[PDB]
Amino acid sequence: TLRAAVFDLDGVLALPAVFGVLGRTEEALALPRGLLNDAFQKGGPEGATTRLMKGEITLSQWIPLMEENCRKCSETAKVCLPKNFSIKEIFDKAISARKINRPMLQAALMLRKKGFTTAILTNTWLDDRAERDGLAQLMCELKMHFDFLIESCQVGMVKPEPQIYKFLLDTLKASPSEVVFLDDIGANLKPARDLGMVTILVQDTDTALKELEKVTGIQLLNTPAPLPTSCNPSDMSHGYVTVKPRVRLHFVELGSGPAVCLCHGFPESWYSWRYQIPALAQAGYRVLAMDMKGYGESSAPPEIEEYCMEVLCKEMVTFLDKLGLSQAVFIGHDWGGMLVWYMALFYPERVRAVASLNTPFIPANPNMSPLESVFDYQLYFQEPGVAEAELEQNLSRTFKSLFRASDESVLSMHKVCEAGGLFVNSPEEPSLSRMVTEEEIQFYVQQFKKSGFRGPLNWYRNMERNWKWACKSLGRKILIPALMVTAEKDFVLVPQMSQHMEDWIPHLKRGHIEDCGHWTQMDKPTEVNQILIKWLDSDAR
Amino acid sequence: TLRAAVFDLDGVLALPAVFGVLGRTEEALALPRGLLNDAFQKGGPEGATTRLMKGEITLSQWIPLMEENCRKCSETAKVCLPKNFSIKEIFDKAISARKINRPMLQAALMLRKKGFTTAILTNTWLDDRAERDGLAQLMCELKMHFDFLIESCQVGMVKPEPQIYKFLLDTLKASPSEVVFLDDIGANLKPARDLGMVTILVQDTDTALKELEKVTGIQLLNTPAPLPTSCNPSDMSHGYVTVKPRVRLHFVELGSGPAVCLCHGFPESWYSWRYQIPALAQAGYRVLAMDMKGYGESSAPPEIEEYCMEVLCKEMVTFLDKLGLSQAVFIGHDWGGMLVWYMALFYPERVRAVASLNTPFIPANPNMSPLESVFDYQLYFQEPGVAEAELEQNLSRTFKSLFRASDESVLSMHKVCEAGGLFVNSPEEPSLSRMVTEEEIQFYVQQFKKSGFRGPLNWYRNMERNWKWACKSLGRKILIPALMVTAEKDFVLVPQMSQHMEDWIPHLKRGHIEDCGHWTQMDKPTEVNQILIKWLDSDAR
Ligand SMILES: O=S(=O)(NC1CCCC1)c1ccnc2nc(-c3ccc(C(F)(F)F)cc3)[nH]c12
Ligand SMILES: O=S(=O)(NC1CCCC1)c1ccnc2nc(-c3ccc(C(F)(F)F)cc3)[nH]c12
């Protein structure tokens, strides 16, 4: 009974195999067959390549030794090499060309989802090339997905020596019989086999995946498309900034590059962006996913006025000031989308680009106060303590009833004042949505235990204030790069409401997601990530 | 009696005045005098420029209006304009060319150091140009230095209207008689004057500074060179990463750009880099100043083995992994310098560049254990509880005795075992060093109250372990960009000890600081910042 899966990197987790390039290179150059491959292996265990894989010498140190061997091995067949021949040029190109083999990673990912323990066991080098970052990026992305990564240069052992196999077993804490070993090399494969581990010779991925599926008894092939990578809160970098005495802002930080600020809606978390954080960071961005004022680890002052857009936008600018950021790409959903449109109208200097999910930008009416105005829920929210008491009564019930996809029984926003509550027609025990796990629901429950629903509800209690402030921007235009994303089945933030936006945002780029409800991020994470990344790459450098 | 100083930005805090460019442009083009200046002012209060300064319209919106006025104002003198004439081209160039007027900022900085309340009062615009970042950077850098920044476009008022002057006074909470007002415009100056505030017409800086010096009775001119900007802990972004259960790492984060990891020595803080953080962030870098394992807000496990270089380097890599960083420029001082050399030897993939202050890189001796070996202090540190008890006895006394510059009475590192203590020859009440304030000393005192000196002292108790691990790197070379910085008067980490480094680090770049003791960062902050930035710009992109 297997409980562990082990993958080689080259020719297994990453493709094309860098190894394969020696063959490609000799035949591209009209060079005698295996001359290059034999130069690589010169001296075998006492050889330059083994010293490299053992961590005795670095990659840049090894290059000259390999070139030398290329000449010594040439003497045998008496041939001469090209003038421009460069080992560095070759591996730089080979390393660069090498990518993650996605079907293989998905297979390793499924096994881990099923309680398997996974590892990467590779014969590798200490890369000190000026171009080493590319491999470092690939290595970072690969793992985060595995329980262990064992590199020969770090452990001082190589394949095929038996000590490495015994080392792998000790790390795994598994008897060989409960382990699958995947390698594209027969030699590196035998030690594991004659130790009793299950082995797969990897030639082609489908055929290798066919063998793995059969061995583990798990559907690995032709499986439906998986969800993007989520976030485990305990594994994140948590940031804390005091924007003013008694008001501190919490955020989650991941990745390097241009700053992308994520602003959630009501009643959410930085955790609403769980599917977005790894993808955008992987896309070459520095993600800062906020806990907006009143939520989670951010401060929740009792006062209503602390939640007007002018005060909220001001603190976001202070947040940038204190973080030492001249700009950030502002991305908001729901109430975050509202804030983000205001950041663009009032502070274009600090905003690289603006993106809104579901929330439309609508210019304020100078002749009518919004309080003049059945999207009844806003009226229900005005009274302090009323909506708080109902929403805080049973938190598990609150989130399960709120967080529902388009096909689920969503819950009405009309005549709620007449009904006397948001959940007055709702079951005591709501069913669990396809969007969330019980564990994910429980995160929100623990987050909302700190401050409750007062601060979040206060976001709705500044209608007249936000309206007066908005009237000042009535003559302005959004001329900075902007993206408006609509959700088909959002019945509060309807795509129709966004139709006249070009009157104020002429260069506006758009996105639309079908069969998507209000909770856009967890509804359609894959579509959201595709739209946002595409837009960031073209408009937000 | 003055207690407040107010500066205009254009022609006062920033130079050349963007205003000045209209004159430069008309005479460069052989254009009638004041044609451009008069096009700018067309309609005065009801004019396009006033609407811009009031925040009614954005900068990109205003450009077309200004071009239009340039044509209408041309009709008067009947002249024709160049084909390539561009208002955008003009202000883009003018805004870009405009810099902070350093002597003026230094003057504003001195007044604030003396208990003055300072502010910036400028007539400005909402910049939505694709090139707005430059101004946003200048604006961010300028302030951080002032109590208030009042922009006309944000407040809806302009100069010369009296409401702005009354607004400034309300923010300041000052009677006009206790305020100095500096403007390069006579018109913007009169309202403040006839309200009774002290006024300076700014033409040239020395002459304007002469007037300010006379008025406030403070030496502003020809004053000695000031210290770089320090850090106020309450104003920083604090980051927290769990690298493993029970071990969390704390850091301070400032700026955008390539990641620069700062690793302090013994017994220090992230606060040891206080002078470096703002300067490097301003230099275009993302600074991460660590609280190394055992210090401040980082975890301090009791176990000795947790402090060996192999475990410490591993956690730093995990820290990068969790932050989503493929690489970071590693900069260390003292024990941080030791760690940083090891990060390069063992993980070149994760290190963009390596920099060490005072700490030399010395290859381990395979034929001799370091424990075989009067730098007595190491021997004094081996015994658990002994050095802890002495160092923890009086924290204020510990830091004041430790943190001493070259001319101060430094304190011996020899025969300390024979003496029976580090401070056995030291006064009960040490004098306060020129390097630190009593307030800065007290920060270290509060930081060391959490974990004590055990974890930090454990860094010294892994000699044999670090030696065995180092022996594995004996055949390796540091071929990644490296900087070695020496301090003349460091008597523990002597510059002589670094002399053979090129044998292992051929491409090594160097730095040297004279009359500098062991506590390099606070000893010579200006020299340190100059060396590090220079090196980062050339070697660390
Ligand atoms: O109150 S608004 O001004 N009304 C808008 C403006 C016109 C159309 C609706 C408002 C402005 C912006 N984003 C908003 N998001 C919500 C909302 C969010 C969650 C839930 C719930 F949790 F209940 F399901 C109910 C409502 N309300 C919002
Ligand atoms: O113990 S080491 O191996 N010896 C070295 C190696 C050869 C020369 C000295 C060591 C290695 C690296 N950085 C070190 N920094 C200190 C040190 C730091 C502060 C104080 C104090 F606080 F007391 F003033 C006393 C000593 N010691 C260090």
From Swiss-Prot, chains A, B:
The modification Phosphoserine is found at S369. Induction: By compounds that cause peroxisome proliferation such as clofibrate, tiadenol and fenofibrate. Its EC number is 3.3.2.10, 3.1.3.76. The keyword Metal-binding applies. Pfam families: Abhydrolase_1, Hydrolase. Residues 258-525 form the AB hydrolase-1 domain. Residues 234-541 are annotated as: Epoxide hydrolase. Keywords: Acetylation, Aromatic hydrocarbons catabolism, Cytoplasm, Detoxification, Hydrolase, Lipid metabolism, Lipoprotein, Magnesium, Metal-binding, Multifunctional enzyme, Peroxisome, Phosphoprotein. Residues 1-223 are annotated as: Phosphatase. It is an enzyme of class 3 (hydrolase). Changing R102C: Decreased phosphatase activity; no effect on epoxyde hydrolase activity. GO terms for cellular component: cytosol; extracellular exosome; peroxisomal matrix; peroxisome. The modification N6-acetyllysine is found at K42, K190, K214. Its cofactor is Mg(2+). GO terms for biological process: cholesterol homeostasis; dephosphorylation; epoxide metabolic process; phospholipid dephosphorylation; positive regulation of gene expression; regulation of cell growth; regulation of cholesterol metabolic process; response to toxic substance. Bifunctional enzyme. The C-terminal domain has epoxide hydrolase activity and acts on epoxides (alkene oxides, oxiranes) and arene oxides. Plays a role in xenobiotic metabolism by degrading potentially toxic epoxides. Also determines steady-state levels of physiological mediators. Bifunctional enzyme. The N-terminal domain has lipid phosphatase activity, with the highest activity towards threo-9,10-phosphonooxy-hydroxy-octadecanoic acid, followed by erythro-9,10-phosphonooxy-hydroxy-octadecanoic acid, 12-phosphonooxy-octadec-9Z-enoic acid and 12-phosphonooxy-octadec-9E-enoic acid. Has phosphatase activity toward lyso-glycerophospholipids with also some lower activity toward lysolipids of sphingolipid and isoprenoid phosphates. Homodimer. Belongs to the AB hydrolase superfamily. Epoxide hydrolase family. The N-terminal domain has phosphatase activity. The C-terminal domain has epoxide hydrolase activity. This is Bifunctional epoxide hydrolase 2.
